[PDB]
From a paper:
The Scar/[name] subunit is kept inactive by various interactions within the Scar/[name]-complex, which consists of the five subunits Nap/Hem, Pir/Sra/CyFip, Abi, Scar/[name] and [name]/[name], in a 1∶1∶1∶1∶1 stoichiometry. [name] is important for the stability of the Scar/[name] subunit in different organisms, and was proposed to function as a precursor for Scar/[name]-complex assembly in Hela S cells. Dictyostelium DdBrk1 encompasses 68 residues and shares 37% sequence identity and 52% similarity with human [name]/[name] (HsBrk1). Here we present the high resolution structure and a biochemical analysis of DdBrk1, which provides new insights on the question of how [name] may function as a precursor during the assembly of the mature Scar/[name]-complex.
As DdBrk1 does not contain any methionines that could be used for selenomethionine substitution, and no molecular replacement model was available, we co-crystallized DdBrk1 in presence of heavy atom salts and collected a 1.5 Å resolution data set of platinum soaked crystals at Pt-peak wavelength. As DdBrk1 was crystallized in presence of 0.2 M Ca2+-ions, it is very likely that the anomalous signal of calcium at platinum peak-wavelength was sufficient for phasing of the relatively small protein due to the high resolution data and high multiplicity of the measurement. Thus, the refinement of the dataset of the native crystal was performed including two Ca2+-ions. The DdBrk1-chain forms a single continuous α-helix and assembles into a triple-coiled-coil (left handed superhelix) with its symmetry molecules along a conserved hydrophobic patch. This triple-helix is stabilized via typical knobs-into-holes interactions with heptad-repeats of lysine residues with an interface area of 935Å2 between the single helices. Hydrogen bonds between Q55 of one chain and D57/E60 in the neighboring chain further stabilize the C-terminal triple-coil domain like a ring, as also observed in the structure of the actin-binding protein coronin 1. The entry into the triple-coil structure is highly hydrophobic and occupied by larger hydrophobic residues with additional stacking interactions (F30, F34).
Numbering used by the authors:
A (entry chain A), B (entry chain A), C (entry chain A): 3 to 65
The structure:
């Protein structure tokens, strides 16, 4: 119960919307890779600072 | 060596399968973003607990 | 100002390129999930080693 013109418009919109969704996925991955990398960086940095604090406490106690 | 009917069916299946694959990617990203966020949460929480333990040990030793 | 032959070629290339981009996204997700999992592993392992070091220092001090 759609005309050929309506059906063709809908089929093209479906394909156009996939092109948009693929771009939205790529943009999300760019943001999420950066976010994740920064968070991992920050955790590593905090662990490195705490490791130094523990090694100094060891040295102060053992001496 | 395919009829027009077979070729048209295959071309449509190809496009339909892309729509399904994009949805599978979106569902995976939803799960993976949540997983990653929770794991990062848990590591931060464990580091915060260990930091408190180290600061208390410092205070007990220095005093 | 394109012939029908040119327009049909371009429309098919557009759809073919989406199939390629979806595969590139899947390949990236495979690599990024593995990378992220390994990095999280490594942070957990480093925290577990530092936790053991802190517990031993506690035991040595308290005794
Ligand atoms: Ca549109
Ligand atoms: Ca349109
Ligand atoms: Ca189908
Ligand atoms: Ca079909
Ligand atoms: Ca091509
Ligand atoms: Ca082609």
């Amino acid at each position: 119960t759609k005309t050929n013109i309506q059906k063709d418009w809908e089929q093209r919109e479906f394909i156009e919307d996939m092109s948009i969704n693929i771009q939205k996925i790529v943009e999300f991955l760019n943001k999420f890779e950066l976010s994740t990398r920064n968070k991992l960086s920050d955790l590593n940095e905090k662990l490195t600072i705490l490791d130094r604090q523990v090694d100094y406490l060891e040295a102060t106690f053992k001496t």
